[PDB]
Design a protein around this ligand. Structure first.
Ligand code: MG
Ligand code: MG
Ligand code: MG
Ligand code: MG
Ligand code: MG
Ligand code: MG
Ligand code: MG
Ligand code: MG
Ligand code: MG
Ligand code: MG
Ligand code: MG
Ligand code: MG
Ligand code: MG
Ligand code: MG
Ligand code: MG
Ligand code: MG
Ligand code: MG
Ligand code: MG
Ligand code: MG
Ligand code: MG
Ligand code: MG
Ligand code: MG
Ligand code: MG
Ligand code: MG
Ligand code: MG
Ligand code: MG
Ligand code: MG
Ligand code: MG
Ligand code: MG
Ligand code: MG
Ligand code: MG
Ligand code: MG
Ligand code: MG
Ligand code: MG
Ligand code: MG
Ligand code: MG
Ligand code: MG
Ligand code: MG
Ligand code: MG
Ligand code: MG
Ligand code: MG
Ligand code: MG
Ligand code: MG
Ligand code: MG
Ligand code: MG
Ligand code: MG
Lengths: 147, 51, 51, 134, 51, 124
RNA sequence: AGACCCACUCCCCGGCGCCGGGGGGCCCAAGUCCUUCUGAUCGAGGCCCAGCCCGUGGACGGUGUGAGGCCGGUAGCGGCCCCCGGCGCGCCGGGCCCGGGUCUUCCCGGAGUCGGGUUGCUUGGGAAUGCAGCCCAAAGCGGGUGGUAAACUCCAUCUAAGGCUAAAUACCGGCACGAGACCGAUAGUCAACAAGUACCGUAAGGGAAAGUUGAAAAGAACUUUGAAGAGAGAGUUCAAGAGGGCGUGAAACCGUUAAGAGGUAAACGGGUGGGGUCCGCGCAGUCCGCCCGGAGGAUUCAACCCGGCGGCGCGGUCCGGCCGUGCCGGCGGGGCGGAUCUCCCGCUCCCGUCGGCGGGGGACCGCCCCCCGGCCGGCGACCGGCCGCCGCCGGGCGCAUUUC
RNA sequence: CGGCUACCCACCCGACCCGUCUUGAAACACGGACCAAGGAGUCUAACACGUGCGCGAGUCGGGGGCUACGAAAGCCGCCGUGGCGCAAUGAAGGUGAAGGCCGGCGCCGGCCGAGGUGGGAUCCCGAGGCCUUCCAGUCCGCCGAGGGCGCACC
RNA sequence: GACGAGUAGGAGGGCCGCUGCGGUGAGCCUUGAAGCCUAGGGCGCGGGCCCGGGUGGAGCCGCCGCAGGUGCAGAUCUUGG
């Protein structure tokens, strides 16, 4: 609110908090990003490196659906399915392993980052990382690819 | 003054329910109701439930 | 009211997912807390001699 | 409180509609309450003032129990003039003093063919209202 | 706290009736005047016509 | 509780009144009639009160019981004392000290009772 | 279109005529009750043991203040009257005697148009997104599109150059409305008033200032000097200290009266002195407790009896209830959720059956509600009945070396 | 009789007219006869930082829908579509975040398992001691040589 | 216990001031509100505020929060005198 702003305590001071030698003029340094190459060179090089110039190829008609591929990690892999699935699989004596369809959850690619608990799984995903697959194989499990 | 001043403010629903829950809880404390100023001295009990 | 805002151990039956906000402190009686043997025993001697 | 969205509650609009009301609305606005005998007889609480009604004065400097007949109804000033409610001017000529119908109680109605049917309609409406109540 | 009292129900005549229901846990929710004031301040602006 | 209610009442109650660099509390059971956590008459489980009687003589002492904390109608018991000043002071002093009923403000109650007693007598 | 099978008649108007959603009109509750101010009350007190009356009506406005009940209205799935409307029936005239599946045979498309070259504008469209001018200017298993120009080669998707169509959508013009954390006559539209008026410019155009008598004009009869403006009386009003641009009436400015001062322009800060204005209702000067002494007056103290109230861990461990944001047991009766498993029904392929999907049901687990039993804690956010102690109040006995 | 203060006068000392620009203003620098009213860092959007509140690897109904003040308020959850965050890097094709030990023939089975050092607020242990006559003596605490597991953070 | 200067500039406290809104004072008020004047009594360092006297006739304020078209000595400032 304007009650608590600084302008309420600036009344009585001639310059209104803007200086007496250099008055608060309209646009002493140009409009917007003016003179980035000329008189704002130091600021645009000390704080915006790479700002000037092009790089890379140009993709004219880019559609995000083609490149849409959310990823999940093995630490969160068990979080997708309910707790009772994991506890029953751990208690299970016949060696049956739960099947985790990460696609139904909404992740296409599985990346292996965290520690995977010692428990057989069947991860049914769309893509797999090399380390993710070898962790699943090492802990004991299967990887199923779906389209 | 322009018509498109930000008249309306939105609040999170969790704290919306927080406030009314606190209001109801405070409504059962005789000190906080007399502090509000309602004449409640001879009321049989503050959580006034009727048939 | 209990079905609206839920109990401490029972969530609200009419809201999608809501429960009463937990207290930051339970025993709010500060005087009773201070005037207990457990705290008073582990205290230093007072110094009320104004110099 | 009022719930009809087509009826104003604004002070300015109500004042404008009152001070610019046409004469046929001025007649209904300038209505005086009936006496206790009249209301217990015709079952009507109030009626618009007319030219030839015997009325009293309830509030003001000229209030009392004396009974006087109206002489004219100056609806432009929201004022009626009575038979003997008057004061002298500087030159000595007597001119009547305007009295609002709100502070006037009708003692005897100058009932006519139209006046009787108005009273019967008002009595009928309030009787069916009371019957609907219970 | 943790207790849950038993609030009686009064009839129309004034005297207490035999019906007696427990106090809902909402009435023991934390009292936060800061949150109530914040919510009231922000929500009272939503029924404001522009000028 | 008590501190929980005080943190709300300390600056929001209708009895609160601030002017001329001073603040007071007009709650019905406030000895010394000043806003403080010690003398508040609504946020404490046990409370005393000294008021003039209905007649121009005597003093009515109001005490808050233990059971009906949430029942304001029966929460207070009013006892009327109509006797000499010394006896009235002794009665109130015994009532607070020997019952251990909020002994923090027994002297304030005695001061208020004495002030009411001297005010009730005819003024020269 | 032909053949073979199945297959329906009630579709549609419009003329006439009988039935149960709007546009306006007229209306509907309750104090002018008793005292009391006032100039007037709508101000203030009371209206019982019907805590004045009504209230589905305590919005608003007016009425000589500030009114739920004086009036209009207000609430109402409240009432009456007139006009018209979308429905649900009847006849009447005609209009059409119309449909689906299988098989056989034929047909099927919009040209100065697309497209290509160039130029110009536009777009984010970048070897040219869209549009237009000029030139060339077609094809039909063809043409267009498939965001990098081109050639070849398989694909995917539509059918351009003909047309119609409510709905959701925009509204600072217009009609009638409602509202506002807005403005309150130098503000707010330029304009609250005879305002786009007066007024200026040849013209296009420019464009103001300007609200408040009083409740009611009751607008000052009449006398007196003067020609009159205008005074002096008188009178109206509570009030002319409201007298026709008249509510309130500041400052700059001016006159008069009173006080003081005055040849270094006036004026200013510190320090005093003098004079005025009023203030201290001052001018024999505060009392407040305890004790001593003297004059007094009480229905009088302490201690006991009865009744009531309250507090207290009383009772180390009285009895009974309630809760746990504590737990345990359950040959208990349930709701929620589960990505924990597993008899019935519906659907599709095959000859009532073997092999599939969806739904329902059952079991299992987690949480929660209720009932029973057993412990822990609390009742100081949440107590009841006895007993014990203490305090207080009332009524007695108390009788003056006590008490006031 | 008292009243510093607010009215006037007299005297002693001090005392250049304000604002603004300027290194330098009382300036022969500019604005200023006096008075009244109006009058100038507001609003929208974006970002960053810090602080308050709710929830928390989740969070948000802002759009839509269901039910005088109220054009409010409540609810949706199989309306979380979507934004932000939970993963970065490369122009792109893409890739995408500990390992060690043991036995057999680079591969198989089992075990340990998600860094180290220096400084690190706090916490844990305790060589003894904190006296009422003196000795042995226990329990509840308190201080403490020294030794540790070390928050955050560098 | 120590310290106290200050332009531009920054921050904090305002029981300093104005207008309106939500609550609150069984608030004030025709037995006289706002406004205005006052050689009156004062308080607060100060922003300013409370009482006394005169006109006024109809509205007004304190506290807790919210919001701003919120404070003038100037700008050859605008309007009016
Ligand atoms: Mg400054
Ligand atoms: Mg600045
Ligand atoms: Mg400057
Ligand atoms: Mg500069
Ligand atoms: Mg700027
Ligand atoms: Mg250069
Ligand atoms: Mg109506
Ligand atoms: Mg009125
Ligand atoms: Mg009354
Ligand atoms: Mg009214
Ligand atoms: Mg009334
Ligand atoms: Mg009426
Ligand atoms: Mg062009
Ligand atoms: Mg191709
Ligand atoms: Mg076509
Ligand atoms: Mg077409
Ligand atoms: Mg068309
Ligand atoms: Mg509205
Ligand atoms: Mg004007
Ligand atoms: Mg004005
Ligand atoms: Mg104007
Ligand atoms: Mg004017
Ligand atoms: Mg005027
Ligand atoms: Mg005026
Ligand atoms: Mg007057
Ligand atoms: Mg006047
Ligand atoms: Mg007036
Ligand atoms: Mg005037
Ligand atoms: Mg003179
Ligand atoms: Mg000198
Ligand atoms: Mg300058
Ligand atoms: Mg310069
Ligand atoms: Mg120079
Ligand atoms: Mg200067
Ligand atoms: Mg010079
Ligand atoms: Mg010059
Ligand atoms: Mg200059
Ligand atoms: Mg000049
Ligand atoms: Mg001004
Ligand atoms: Mg932050
Ligand atoms: Mg984004
Ligand atoms: Mg300093
Ligand atoms: Mg404003
Ligand atoms: Mg003066
Ligand atoms: Mg008036
Ligand atoms: Mg000025």
């Amino acid at each position: 609110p304007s009650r608590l702003r600084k302008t309420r305590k600036l009344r009585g001071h001639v310059s209104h908090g803007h200086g007496r030698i250099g008055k608060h003029r309209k646009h002493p340094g140009g409009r917007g990003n003016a003179g980035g190459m000329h008189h704002h060179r130091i600021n645009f090089d000390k704080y915006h490196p790479g700002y000037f110039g092009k790089v890379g190829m140009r993709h004219y008609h880019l559609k995000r659906n083609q490149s849409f591929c959310p990823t999940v990690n093995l630490d969160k892999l068990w979080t997708l399915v309910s707790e009772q699935t994991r506890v029953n699989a751990a208690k299970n004596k016949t060696g049956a392993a739960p099947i985790i369809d990460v696609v139904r959850s909404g992740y296409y690619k599985v990346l292996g980052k965290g520690k995977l608990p010692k428990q057989p799984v069947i991860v049914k995903a769309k893509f797999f990382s090399r380390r993710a697959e070898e962790k699943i194989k090492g802990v004991g499990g299967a990887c199923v690819l779906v389209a | 003054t322009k018509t498109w001043r930000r008249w309306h403010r939105r609040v999170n629903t969790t704290q919306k329910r927080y406030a009314i829950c606190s209001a109801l809880a405070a409504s059962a404390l005789p000190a906080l109701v007399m502090s509000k100023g309602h004449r409640i001295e001879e009321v049989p009990e503050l959580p006034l439930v009727v048939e | 009211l209990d079905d609206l805002y839920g109990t401490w151990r029972k969530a609200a039956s009419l809201k999608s997912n809501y429960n009463l906000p937990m207290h930051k402190m339970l025993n709010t009686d500060l005087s009773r807390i201070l005037k207990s043997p457990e705290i008073q025993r582990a205290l230093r001697a007072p110094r009320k001699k104004i110099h | 409180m009022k719930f009809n969205p087509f009826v104003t509650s604004d002070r300015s609009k109500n004042r404008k509609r009152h001070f610019n009301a046409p004469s046929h609305i001025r007649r209904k606005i300038m209505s005086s309450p009936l006496s206790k005998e009249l209301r217990q007889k015709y079952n009507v609480r109030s009626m618009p003032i007319r030219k030839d009604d015997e009325v009293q004065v309830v509030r003001g400097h000229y209030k009392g129990q004396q009974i006087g007949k109206v002489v004219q109804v100056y609806r432009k000033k929201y004022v009626i003039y009575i038979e003997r409610v008057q004061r002298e001017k500087a030159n000595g000529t007597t001119v009547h003093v305007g009295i609002h119908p709100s502070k006037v109680v009708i003692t005897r109605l100058k009932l006519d063919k139209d006046r009787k049917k108005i009273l019967e309609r008002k009595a009928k409406s309030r009787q069916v209202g009371k019957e609907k109540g219970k | 706290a943790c207790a849950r009292p038993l609030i009686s129900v009064y009839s129309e005549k004034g005297e207490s009736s035999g019906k007696n229901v427990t106090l809902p846990a909402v009435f023991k929710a934390p009292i936060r005047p800061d949150i109530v004031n914040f919510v009231h301040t922000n929500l009272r602006k939503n029924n404001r016509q522009p000028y | 509780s008590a501190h929980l209610q005080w943190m709300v009442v300390r600056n929001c109650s209708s009895f609160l009144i601030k002017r001329n660099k001073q603040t007071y509390s007009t709650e019905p059971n406030n000895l010394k009639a000043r806003n403080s956590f010690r003398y508040n008459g609504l946020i404490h489980r046990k409370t005393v009160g000294v008021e003039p009687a209905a007649d121009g003589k005597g003093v009515v002492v109001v005490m808050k019981r233990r059971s009906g904390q949430r029942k304001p109608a029966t929460s207070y018991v009013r006892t009327t004392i109509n006797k000499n000043a010394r006896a009235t002071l002794s009665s109130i002093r015994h009532m607070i000290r020997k019952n251990k009923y909020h002994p923090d403000l027994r002297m304030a109650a005695i001061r208020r009772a004495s002030a009411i007693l001297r005010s009730q007598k005819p003024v020269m």
